[PDB]
């Protein structure tokens, strides 16, 4: 996962040499700033059930014809997969505030998300709806420079829908 | 690769003698029903993503440990794996259908893909399962006699089980 | 001398191509290589940096 | 008042009218920019490789 | 375009030798569904109106929620490029009957389709029920080997777009 | 490839200078006003889709003769090729302007950019007024206040208009 | 081998896409054309005897220098590996026939082909007159398509020999 | 490279149109006849050796300045290169037959060619007077009558000559 210090280890190892000052640099400017992304963490995995709910609504408010009869929305399994898709999103955003890289989004969402939405007639549109709607939670939920982190990794994860 | 009329010709070479009249008749015959067959193969590529999706829900809803977190299906990569897995499966299967031959399916694919599934980790029972499901879910298109003359292609359904139950067995 | 390596392609090398793609046709997993000794480092760092898992080098 | 102008003509015009959908109107007009989609790998002569 | 005859001439080239049987064979089969192919293209080209707005109104029954205001199909420009777009995708599966292979419809639909989409937001899914109806409606203009050739390109757009 | 402190280095290194009290300065002002910079920089790329689709929109509302049939974004391939060029040259505009300097734009993006959309006829004037839209649809992204600590910018935003400009330029 | 279903699986294959119009238009062409080939193989089948030794005499009335002593074409062992190598070519053309592919004819004879002959001085030219003159009985054998197809392979043999 | 068939498809889609009546019964036309378009080139691809040894020999009886130490077909790598290059244009004006546009030689055996012999020193004149040899060759085989049903096949001796023309003319 591309965490930032894994990527100054890749580096390094790629040019083959020791760890100049340069990316000992990179390290530190993860060190300091790792605070404001793990308290982010914390905070967004204090209020997932309702971030889930909430991303939930939005998405059949904004797309209300997806409820009805006869396609994705209706049926309670689907809910049901709706709300652990969008737990899932908000858990790895989590785990990349905690890694302080777009690694754990990268590999767990993002690679292989195409193919699979269009094999399961699944529309981007709603997760990018479900991420609208978590990011404008957490701009109240969160304040200070964790704000800047948790928007940068939800809309990272958005332009990875679209 | 090799054909069915590829193969007469391998086993006259190996005994070094031109292929017996009975040879000529049975792949006259094949000759004959290669209209059917390529009926066949069309039935299999013009619905192969409808077969995917079947298969791969039916198997899921079936096999719910691959979707939950820790399973061998479980992040997007995995999932897409797997489609492609099936995907490329059913393409080799239709490639035997159309040749006739088991060769181009036995060739490049079974026999190494064995030490794959095992490397990576995957339950190959499942992947057995998920290749008896495409072959349940093409049945009924290989069936499907809209848009195409009323005829009997029993030999057809039976070589393209064949080689599905094939794969499914030497993946298993 | 000559070194035969055998590397076994697993998840480390999965997740890369999973990230850049296929650029070149997927292959199966398991598979010999046969470099010099002047070549054995750099070949054995690079199936390294590629995440490739060696199972057993054979020399000849 | 008869017809003023030849059936020939009239065909002639209802088939290449027809020839193009919605017939010719202000917005499925061509590009006057005549390229076709193999324009620049043939005119570079790079097709082949 | 990756026509039978081209494609023939290509791999004769690539291996820098001459038309053997194969090739000439394979020329010959399509030399032969010619003739049920431009049939196919005579009928679909005399019928392309009543095809594609029976074609669009397909689509606007099977989405209805696209035609309200405040999305795509609203207004009489959204529609017009909707009659424009399966008017293309009509014209090519003709253009590929003529031509006896999947060139026109590869070159000039799939190439890039996804993107395209993904760029616009346009849902594969309206082109696939407007291909569904035109290979309804081709089932009632066309019999036998016409009606073969047809459904044949028709099912090789579908699958592009699924 | 070279930033403004690398810069202000070669600048030194051809007099055979040490760098100037004015120059540090000059280059303690740029580090302060960094994180700005980062900012403007994640208004790029987070907004990049958008800043795309609304150059796009308008380039081919503007200019329709490209989207017709004949015209050079006009089937699937070339309009994907299109968009795919804004994407590139956005890419590199927001690396200039972490930088802080247009050199990687130049050197890697915009040098012979001209004589590819000469050779494939591609109508460079109309590459020039789709990098002019996406410079005005990245101003509206940059110049938003929401989520970030409200304080002057001018000196970013002008900078970025110079990138765009350049560009523009270039491709022209 | 090189057969026309063989050559529209590997370019199928090599693509990593499925069977469609161009290909199945091509396995069509075989389809028709299988009449004809085994039509032509079965003829060729019954007299491989008179044409084996008419070649072989063909031969020896065309190089007469060749059966002087001393020469290849002196002694009964070198005429009866005469007749076996005419038998050989005639067996392998009608497999070619059956196969409807130059595959058979390529792999069992064509590929080694000159440095085999190089390595033992076996003067092509032997060869050429030797499927000359079984050409010139295929045209009295054979009649209608099948007399077209036994004559293009024999051509491409004398192709790969001259 | 195009055939007529996608010659025409790109015409009318310039044109935005489906493909007029008219233009339909010409490319019926040219499939229809297309059976003596496969004699013809197989007339080419068999006699080959035949039309390049007959090509060679005339040429090189005309012009013996070619073989003379100093020639450019002096020693036996350059009279080799001579052979594969009067090969390659039979080969290529044999694809064009098949095809039926010229469009072949020039996307791929003439694209570079004069610029080749030019910078190689090669004689165009004695190129483009092998090839007219080549096409005298070439008639004698594509009149031959026998083995073929008799019938008019004016239209293809004529395109025949008028690719091998082209040719000549481009290298000259
Ligand atoms: C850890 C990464 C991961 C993700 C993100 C993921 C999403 C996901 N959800 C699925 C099912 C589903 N997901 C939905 C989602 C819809 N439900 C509606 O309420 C909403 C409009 C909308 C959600 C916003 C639906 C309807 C299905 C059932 C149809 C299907 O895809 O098979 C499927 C198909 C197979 C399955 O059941 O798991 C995937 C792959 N799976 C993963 O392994
Ligand atoms: C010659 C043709 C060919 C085949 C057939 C082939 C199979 C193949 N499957 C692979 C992984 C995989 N294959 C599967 C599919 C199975 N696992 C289960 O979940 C599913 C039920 C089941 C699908 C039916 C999965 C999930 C992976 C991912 C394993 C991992 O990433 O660790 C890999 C490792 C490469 C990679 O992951 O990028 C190969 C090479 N490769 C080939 O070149
Ligand atoms: C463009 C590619 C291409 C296709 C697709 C193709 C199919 C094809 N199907 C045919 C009829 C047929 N098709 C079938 C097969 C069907 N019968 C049953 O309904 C089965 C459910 C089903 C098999 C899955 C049969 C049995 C015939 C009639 C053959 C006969 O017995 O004479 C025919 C002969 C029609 C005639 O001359 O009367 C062709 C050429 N040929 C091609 O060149
Ligand atoms: C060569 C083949 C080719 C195709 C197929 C093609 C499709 C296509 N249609 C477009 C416009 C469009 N097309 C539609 C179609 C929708 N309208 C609704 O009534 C329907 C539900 C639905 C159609 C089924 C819409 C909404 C747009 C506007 C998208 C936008 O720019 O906002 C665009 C965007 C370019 C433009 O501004 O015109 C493309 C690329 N383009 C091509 O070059
Ligand atoms: C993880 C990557 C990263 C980000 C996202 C980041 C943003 C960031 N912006 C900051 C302040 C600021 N940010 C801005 C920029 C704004 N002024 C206007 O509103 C413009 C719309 C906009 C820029 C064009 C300004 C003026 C300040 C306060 C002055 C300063 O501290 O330099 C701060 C310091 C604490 C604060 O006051 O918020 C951070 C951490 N820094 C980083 O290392
Ligand atoms: C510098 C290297 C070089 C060599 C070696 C060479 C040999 C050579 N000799 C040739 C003609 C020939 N050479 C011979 C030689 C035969 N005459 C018979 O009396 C003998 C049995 C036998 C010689 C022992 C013959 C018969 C021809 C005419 C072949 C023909 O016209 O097709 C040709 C064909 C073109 C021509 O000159 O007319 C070549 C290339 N050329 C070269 O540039
Ligand atoms: C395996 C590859 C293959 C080949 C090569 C092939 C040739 C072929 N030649 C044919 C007859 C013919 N061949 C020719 C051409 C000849 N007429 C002579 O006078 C000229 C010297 C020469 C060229 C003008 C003609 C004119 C016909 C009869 C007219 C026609 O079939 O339309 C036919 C039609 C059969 C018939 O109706 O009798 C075929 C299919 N078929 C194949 O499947």
Chains 1, 5, 7 share one sequence.
Not at chain 1, 33 to 38: E, T
Not at chain 3, 13 to 25: D, E, I, L, S
Request: aromatic share 8%; glycine share 6%; proline share 4%.
């Amino acid at each position: 996962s591309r965490t930032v210090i894994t990527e100054v280890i890749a580096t390094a190892d790629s040019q083959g040499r020791f760890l100049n000052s340069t990316e000992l640099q990179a390290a530190f400017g993860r060190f300091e700033r790792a605070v404001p992304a793990i308290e982010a963490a914390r905070a967004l995995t204090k209020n997932q059930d309702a971030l889930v709910k909430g991303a939930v609504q939005a998405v059949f408010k904004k797309f209300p014809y997806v409820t009805q009869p006869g396609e994705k929305g209706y049926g309670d399994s689907n809910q049901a997969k709706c709300a652990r898709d969008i737990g899932y999103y908000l858990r790895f955003i989590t785990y990349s505030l905690v890694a302080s890289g777009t690694g754990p989004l990268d590999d767990y969402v993002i690679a292989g998300l195409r193919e699979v939405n269009r094999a399961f007639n699944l529309n981007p549109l709603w997760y990018i709806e479900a991420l609208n709607y978590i990011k404008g939670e957490t701009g109240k939920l969160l304040s200070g420079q964790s704000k800047t982190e948790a928007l940068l990794y939800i809309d990272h994860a958005i332009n990875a829908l679209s | 690769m090799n054909d069915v009329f590829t193969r007469a010709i391998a086993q006259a070479d190996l005994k070094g003698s031109f292929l017996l009249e009975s040879d000529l008749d049975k792949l006259a015959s094949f000759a004959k029903e290669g209209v059917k067959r390529l009926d066949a193969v069309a039935a299999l590529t013009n619905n192969a993503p409808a077969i995917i999706s079947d298969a791969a829900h039916k198997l899921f809803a079936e096999q719910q440990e691959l979707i939950q977190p820790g399973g061998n299906a479980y992040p997007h990569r995995r999932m897409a794996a797997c489609l492609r897995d099936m995907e490329i499966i059913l393409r080799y299967v239709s490639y035997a259908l159309l040749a006739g031959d088991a060769s181009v399916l036995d060739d490049r694919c079974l026999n190494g893909l064995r030490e794959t599934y095992n490397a990576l980790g995957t339950p190959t029972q499942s992947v057995a399962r998920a290749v008896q499901l495409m072959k349940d879910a093409a049945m009924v298109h290989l069936k499907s006699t809209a848009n195409v003359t009323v005829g009997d292609c029993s030999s057809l359904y039976s070589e393209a089980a064949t080689y599905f139950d094939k794969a499914a067995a030497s993946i298993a | 001398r000559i070194y035969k390596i055998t590397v076994s392609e697993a998840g480390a090398y999965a997740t890369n191509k999973h990230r850049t793609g296929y650029r070149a046709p997927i292959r199966q997993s398991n598979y010999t290589l046969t470099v010099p000794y002047d070549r054995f480092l750099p070949e054995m760092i690079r199936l390294h940096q590629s995440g490739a898992k060696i199972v057993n080098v054979t020399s000849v | 008042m008869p017809a003023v102008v030849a059936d020939q003509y009239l065909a002639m015009a209802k088939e290449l009218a027809a020839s193009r959908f919605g017939g010719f109107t202000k917005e499925n007009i061509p590009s006057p920019m005549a390229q076709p989609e193999s324009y620049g790998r043939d005119r570079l002569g790079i097709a082949a490789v």
